[PDB]
Amino acid sequence: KTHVQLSLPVLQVRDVLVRGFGDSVEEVLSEARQHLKDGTCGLVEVEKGVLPQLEQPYVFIKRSDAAPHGHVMVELVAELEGIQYGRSGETLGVLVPHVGEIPVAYRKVLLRK
């Protein structure tokens, strides 16, 4: 399928144990997609002081359209030293590995896979 319904656990930035997916734009997009498939991907909502507490390159989910069955359609954009790889709508959050942190909420998304 081109799209897959996911419910992403929303984590508080200070709980996050693994603060990014890797060391290149290509690796973080790769790892993010693998974790999203495996159900091991969390979401941190971007506010003041969040991103400096996470590791670059960043992987964002961005709104790709205006929401089947409550799932906002999203796609991945990476960022490294202020350059983004991909073009999409508004950021819903930054993706991180999920390794058992307790979420505060779930974000239903339809991921362009």
Nearest to 67 by CA among 90, 96, 34: 90
3 state SS of 107: strand
Q: Cα separations (Å) of 24 from 7, 10, 59, 102, 106?
A: 26, 24, 11, 28, 28
Nearest-CA neighbor of 110 among 85, 75, 78?
75
Bridge partners for 108 per DSSP:
7
By the 8 A CB rule, do 34 and 113 touch? no
Q: Quick one: CATH architecture of 3-112?
A: Roll (2.30)
CB contact at 8 A, 31 and 40:
no
Structure solved using which method?
Answer: X-ray
Q: How many residues comprise the chain?
A: 113
Structure tokens at 85: 């790889």
Please name which of 6, 76, 75, 63 lies closest in space to residue 40, comparing C-alpha atoms: 6
* Torsion 18-20-24-26 (CA) sign: positive
* Two tokens, residue 29: 């997009």
